[PDB]
């Protein structure tokens, strides 16, 4: 086999991202979890030498084993191979010299899109959250995911909680810890971890398989989150044996109150039990673009 798919995680770490550790001043903790924590920080001399820059720094728990350390370097290498895009939390640097690996990414001041919709829900109108912002959010997330799919990458945890918002109502997909390049192929996950069942495609729940089409299913659930203004999916349906039975038999959520028919038509195709009948993110983008032109 003289031809091979290049594994981005097998490539060496590019030290063009290396940033001096002593030039980071940590601030308030933005979020924590089983992985570790993401803290807001000031990068002194990151872009401009004498200009401090507010950034986000992802780090592991101090008790992380050797396998947990090598996983954070892989995500760094994946983000390096992915490249920059406006609709993803882009990589800005890294601290890799003989210490706890620090991943420096872009900072999004308005937080996650899920909590943003919930505080602006009471003041929603068809400084106000409008329908035009929801269509713009759906459009930007479709573009970021189309950029990921164009690089043969799956996110595997697409949800409104993982969409960040910054200045200018720009949405960026974040959290690439489970992002996988599946060029060889498409990805069967084997591990012990809590899973977001209500966002997962049926094949992911029953066979633990993840593809471009499973990301499309999650995007449809994200659209329901967006046009229901941050409500939990499948309200009144706990994750139990009856939930799996209904999902398998074809139960789907009805249209949210503020979703246009064309947008709900996208959700239904995203929720097709046949993965090959679901649209691609490239198709979703061209569909939303035709909708936005009509104002």
Curated annotation (Swiss-Prot):
Residues noted as binding Mg(2+) in the record, renumbered to the chain: 3, 162, 175
Explain the induction of this protein: Up-regulated by cis-retinoic acid in neuroblastoma cell lines.
Question: Is Electron transport a UniProt keyword of this protein?
Answer: no
Indicate the segments forming the Protein kinase domain, all copies: 24-295
Q: Which residues carry this modification: Phosphotyrosine?
A: 3, 5, 187, 264
- Mutating residue 181 to Y: what's the consequence? In MASTSYS and MASTC; also found in acute myeloid leukemia and a germ cell tumor of the testis; somatic mutation; constitutively activated
What are the binding positions for ATP in this chain? 31-38, 58, 106-112, 161
Q: Name one GO molecular function term.
A: SH2 domain binding
- Can you tell me which residues form the catalytic site? 157
Q: What else is known?
A: Numerous proteins are phosphorylated in response to KIT signaling, but it is not evident to determine which are directly phosphorylated by KIT under in vivo conditions.
> What's this chain's function?
Tyrosine-protein kinase that acts as a cell-surface receptor for the cytokine KITLG/SCF and plays an essential role in the regulation of cell survival and proliferation, hematopoiesis, stem cell maintenance, gametogenesis, mast cell development, migration and function, and in melanogenesis. In response to KITLG/SCF binding, KIT can activate several signaling pathways. Phosphorylates PIK3R1, PLCG1, SH2B2/APS and CBL. Activates the AKT1 signaling pathway by phosphorylation of PIK3R1, the regulatory subunit of phosphatidylinositol 3-kinase.
Protein family: Belongs to the protein kinase superfamily. Tyr protein kinase family. CSF-1/PDGF receptor subfamily.
- Please give the name of this protein: Mast/stem cell growth factor receptor Kit
Q: Which organism is it from?
A: Homo sapiens
Q: What is the lineage of its organism?
A: Eukaryota, Metazoa, Chordata, Craniata, Vertebrata
């Amino acid at each position: 086999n003289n031809y091979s798919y290049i594994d981005p995680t097998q490539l060496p770490y590019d030290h063009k991202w290396e940033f001096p550790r002593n030039r980071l001043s940590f601030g308030k903790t933005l979020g924590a979890g089983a992985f570790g924590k993401v803290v807001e920080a000031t990068a002194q001399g990151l872009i401009k030498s004498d200009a401090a820059m507010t950034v986000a720094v992802k780090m592991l728990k101090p008790s992380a084993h050797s396998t947990e350390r090598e996983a954070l370097m892989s995500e760094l290498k994946v983000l390096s191979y992915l490249g920059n895009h406006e609709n993803i939390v882009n990589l800005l640097g890294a601290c890799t010299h003989g210490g706890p690996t620090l991943v420096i990414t872009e900072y999004c001041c308005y937080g996650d899109l899920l909590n943003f919709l919930r505080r602006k829900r009471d003041e929603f109108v068809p400084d106000f959250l409008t329908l035009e912002h929801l269509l713009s959010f759906s459009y930007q997330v479709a573009k970021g995911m189309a950029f990921l799919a164009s690089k043969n990458c799956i996110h595997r945890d697409l949800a409104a909680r993982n969409i960040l918002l910054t200045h200018g109502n720009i949405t960026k997909i974040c959290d690439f810890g489970l992002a996988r390049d599946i060029k060889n192929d498409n990805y069967v996950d084997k591990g012990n971890a809590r899973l977001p069942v209500k966002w997962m495609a049926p094949e992911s729940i029953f066979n633990s398989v993840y593809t471009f089409e499973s990301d499309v299913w999650s995007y449809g659930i994200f659209l329901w989150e967006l046009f229901s203004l941050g409500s939990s999916p499948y309200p009144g349906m706990p994750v139990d044996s009856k939930f799996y039975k209904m999902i398998k038999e074809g139960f789907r959520m009805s249209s949210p109150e503020y979703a246009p028919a064309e947008m709900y038509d996208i959700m239904k195709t995203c929720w097709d039990a046949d993965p090959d009948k679901r649209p691609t993110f490239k198709q979703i983008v061209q569909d939303i673009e035709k909708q936005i032109s009509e104002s």
